[PDB]
């Protein structure tokens, strides 16, 4: 892994190709953001010095996207242009802090220039009760794991800055340019060709059953998106984290998907649902690649087929799903590589016919700052089109496993969604109390 400054054109990864093929409205407004807080406040001269080193260290944050001849070309720029856009607000005397911060946050969320950059927007909101720091980055160069690297490096860069040290960050891992270059070689490799029989077997043995909606609409705009969330108590979560795993020796994704399949069964009255599960995507694509400290959009999407044939036997149900995901090779990273990067007609005719309507994503459990209670503002454009009928996220914060279901109000009433969420909880509690008795 080189430690210099990476420049030049990079190839579009499958998750990047999937973003452009959707043809979103205002595709420049499609970000991920976090809002930080510090009671004693931030120093803007130190925040700028930290981000000046972060964007120089992580070369993927200097990316721009050009639409020449209709095709899209992403170039990793050098240290010649601006590395980030900064916003400074002095709201120490203002009346309403939340309504003013949220209003300014949304404007910063929608002002990302994709062709000329920069893709990183940093906003500092100074109030009478501390300083709020908003960090909004376009989703094309960041994902969940990349944000954990950001929290580590920024907390270290800001620490070295106040101690009047020259900011020294850990050694660079493989660049995002090297990953995408190796991704095409692994795409045309023969190890990936050994997966075609599995994905082809999956696409032919499944029976599609459309999920019921309260209403039918052709308006998939993001402005109609609402979220219904439920959380578990911190004794229920630690039981799920420390006392229920090694009875079946499962992982987090096994128990969360088992209770999800039974929830859809008690809610939509089905026995088979195809879920669009998302993985970290930092798997072994040969060449001994290392992307532990690499920031980028590595998200891998692949359909998972849940079976609710016999929901009475919960022991048989958990073992059914646990062994269902073990059958998947390399965490499904090879699925969309086969439909976006592979340059050969695969000997078994793979058609990619599975169209999942539910998306699942487990973000994981979430040291110098603190996270602000304020929101980040609208992350997508209000005119942006919805891709999935239901977006189900899962994260652990403050010792509480908190599930969130995203839906459109033009398709579901909040009561229909609340039934699926209450059915999802009555199975999560049933699993932890069943796995703790074993």
Curated annotation (Swiss-Prot):
Belongs to the ATP-dependent AMP-binding enzyme family. Tyrocidine is a mixture of four cyclic decapeptides, tyrocidine A (D-Phe-Pro-Phe-D-Phe-Asn-Gln-Tyr-Val-Orn-Leu), B, C, and D, in which Phe, at positions 3, 4, and Tyr residues are gradually replaced by Trp, depending on the relative concentrations of these amino acids in the growth medium. Activates the second to fourth amino acids in tyrocidine (in tyrocidine A, Pro, Phe, and D-Phe) and epimerizes the last one. Consists of three modules, including a C-terminal epimerization domain. Each module incorporates one amino acid into the peptide product and can be further subdivided into domains responsible for substrate adenylation, thiolation, condensation (not for the initiation module), and epimerization (optional), and N methylation (optional). This is Tyrocidine synthase 2. Large multienzyme complex of TycA, TycB and TycC.
């Amino acid at each position: 892994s080189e430690q210099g400054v990476v420049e030049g054109e990079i190839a579009l990864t499958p998750i990047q190709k999937w973003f452009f093929a959707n043809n979103f409205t205002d595709r420049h407004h499609w970000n991920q953001a976090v809002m930080l807080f510090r009671e004693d406040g931030f120093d803007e001269g130190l925040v700028r010095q930290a981000f000046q080193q972060i964007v120089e260290h992580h070369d993927a944050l200097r990316m721009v996207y050009k639409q020449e001849d209709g095709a899209i070309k992403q170039i990793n720029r050098g240290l010649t242009d601006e590395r980030f856009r900064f916003y400074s607000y002095d709201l120490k005397n203002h009346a309403n802090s939340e309504a003013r911060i949220l209003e300014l946050s949304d404007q910063i969320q929608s002002s990302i220039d994709l062709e000329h950059g920069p893709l990183v927007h940093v906003a500092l909101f100074a109030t009478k009760d501390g300083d709020h720091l908003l960090v909004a980055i376009h989703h094309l160069v960041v994902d969940g794991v990349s944000w954990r690297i950001l929290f580590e490096d920024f907390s270290s860069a800001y620490s070295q800055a106040l101690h009047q040290q020259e900011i020294v960050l850990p050694k660079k891992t493989d660049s995002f340019k090297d990953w995408a270059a190796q991704l095409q070689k692994y795409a045309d490799s023969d190890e990936l060709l050994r997966e075609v029989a599995y994905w082809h077997n999956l696409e032919t043995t499944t029976t599609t059953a459309a999920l019921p909606t309260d209403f039918v609409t052709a308006d998939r705009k993001q402005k109609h998106t609402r979220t219904l969330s439920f959380a578990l108590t911190v004794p229920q979560t630690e039981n799920l984290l420390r006392h229920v795993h090694h009875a079946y020796h499962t992982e987090m994704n096994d128990l969360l998907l088992t209770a999800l399949g039974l929830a859809v069964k008690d809610w939509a009255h089905t026995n088979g649902v195809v879920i669009n599960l998302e993985g970290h995507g930092r798997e072994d694509i040969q060449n001994e690649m290392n992307v532990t400290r690499t920031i980028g959009w590595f998200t891998s999407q692949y359909p998972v087929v849940l079976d609710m044939e016999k929901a009475e036997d919960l022991p048989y149900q958990i073992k059914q799903t646990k062994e269902n995901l073990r059958r998947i090779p390399k965490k499904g990273i090879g699925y969309e590589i086969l439909r976006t990067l592979t340059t050969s007609q695969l000997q078994p005719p793979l058609a990619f016919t599975l169209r999942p309507e539910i998306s699942f994503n487990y973000l994981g459990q979430f040291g110098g700052f603190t996270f602000s209670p304020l929101g980040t503002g609208q992350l997508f454009s209000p005119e942006s089109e919805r891709v999935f009928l239901l977006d189900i996220s899962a994260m652990i914060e403050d010792g509480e496993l908190r599930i969130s279901v995203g839906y459109s109000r033009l398709q579901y009433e909040e009561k229909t969604i609340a039934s699926l969420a209450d059915s999802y909880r009555k199975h999560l509690l049933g699993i932890i109390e069943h796995c703790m008795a074993k």
